[PDB]
Symmetry: C2
Subunit: 193 residues, 2 copies
């Protein structure tokens, strides 16, 4: 009904699944909604505006582990947050590309602030706390982007394991390797590690 912000966004998310991020246009949204382009332009000025809104919505609907639980270890937080971020990005076609193409908003910023506070209370310097969250982000993004976009002996015989599964195993394994690296760096303090 018909041009509520929430309805434009929901039709635009449907459209995103049909046509992908490069195909998504305000012209096709207006057609989908049954409305003339000037009518829609009142509500959504351009594709950049649209895409910004979609990015926010994807995370608001699906990124349910954005914040640490009470008593939770920093390791669990990063593991749960990473898994949640990946799931959220995998829900819509080109979901990672939508996330990438947008500047953060007051939400992301506010959420990241609480995450930095959390990490610092657990012994991280601001910088290592920030490097940690960023790395998990970059790693999760790269994995999903590769998953969503799309012969020699050894590569063959390993691929029978990488391909009965859509990236999760590798992602989860790499995530544990990083976490343990952070644990080791954290615990070393001023010592050579």
């Amino acid at each position: 009904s018909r041009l509520d912000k929430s309805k434009v966004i929901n039709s635009a998310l449907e459209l995103l699944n049909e046509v992908g991020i490069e195909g998504l246009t305000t012209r096709k949204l207006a057609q989908k909604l049954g409305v003339e382009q000037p009518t829609l332009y009142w509500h959504v000025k351009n594709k950049r505006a649209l895409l910004d809104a979609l990015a926010v919505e994807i995370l608001a609907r699906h990124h349910d582990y954005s914040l640490p639980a009470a008593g939770e270890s920093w390791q669990s937080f990063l593991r749960n947050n990473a898994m949640s971020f990946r799931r959220a990005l995998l829900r819509y076609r080109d979901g990672a590309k939508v996330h990438l193409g947008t500047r953060p908003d007051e939400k992301q910023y506010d959420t990241v602030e609480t995450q930095l506070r959390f990490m610092t209370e657990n012994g991280f310097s601001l910088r290592d706390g920030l490097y940690a969250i960023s790395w998990v982000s970059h790693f999760t993004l790269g994995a999903v982007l590769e998953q969503q976009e799309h012969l020699p002996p050894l590569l063959r015989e390993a691929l029978q394991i990488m391909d009965s599964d859509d990236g999760e195993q590798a992602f989860l394994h790499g995530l544990e390797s990083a976490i343990r690296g952070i644990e080791v760096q954290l615990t070393a303090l001023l010592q050579i590690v």
Copy 2:
């Protein structure tokens, strides 16, 4: 001169820097080259073909640490290869997007085969060897993609450090955390770690 494969690719790389990946079109390449569209179509059928060629070329020109040196430790290999991959992707506008949007070729495949052999001779199972290389890839890709695409207390006071530098420090730090994670998993063998 004028439509050699190598000359089409070099003009197309120049064009990529001017207009970016979504703007890049065979129509603008033909204009740049001074040739009619049917003439160019003989040589390059479509943008997908073009982009595939560009992806290969970027790595061939700049990804100079694709293979391990004689006597090199697996840790050095992953560190040097990662740094090389990131540098190569940062050379052209939308370079990571160009890399992402392409299926690998006989080169990438052949190179990855030699990397798997290398990793396996250093104690990695095929799967952990493969997970390792993939993670480094995903992490490097995510970082560069974020770098190439584009206020609360603690985020502020950390950002004065993340932003006098274009991602390298964070990237290098996260890379060491992963490597140490792999070292720990490698060394544990069948023990609880």
